[PDB]
């Protein structure tokens, strides 16, 4: 009758309640508990793992590597920005848009 013992003990369902921030330190913010700090802790661990993954990849980077995207695209401060394509209108259509606008 192990379960019978358990059912009697759980007859009362009042659970322990949480304490709040003291009043004289109210402007600082909410008193963080283990449930709240765990959100902040796992966030840091994900980013530091990603930078370590990135920094390792820079070790074996080959400066002589060549890809055909490199010919038409130039780095800007080290960042590989894909510049927007040009529209390449000609004077006849440019005159046509202004007639439509007026």
């Amino acid at each position: 009758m192990a379960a019978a013992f358990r059912k009697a003990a759980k007859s009362r369902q009042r659970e322990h309640r949480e304490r709040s921030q003291p009043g004289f330190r109210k402007h600082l913010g909410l008193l963080e508990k283990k449930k709240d700090y765990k959100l902040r802790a796992d966030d840091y661990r994900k980013k530091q793992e990603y930078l370590k993954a990135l920094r390792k990849k820079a070790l074996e980077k080959n400066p002589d590597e060549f890809y055909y995207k490199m010919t038409r695209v130039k780095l800007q401060d080290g960042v590989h920005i894909i510049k927007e394509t040009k529209e390449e209108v000609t004077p006849e259509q440019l005159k046509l848009m202004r007639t439509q606008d007026v």
Partner: protein, 49 residues
Amino acid sequence: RLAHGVRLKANKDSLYKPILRQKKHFNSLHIPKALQKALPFKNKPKTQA
């Protein structure tokens, strides 16, 4: 306490009150400009202007 005039005064701090927490947001990861250049072409983050 009944014989005298002493009355119970409960500390406001000790009492239990609803917390009312709000969703918490975090900054996006910022990669240094030097690292983006150092990274290989395959792993280079490529964005639009």
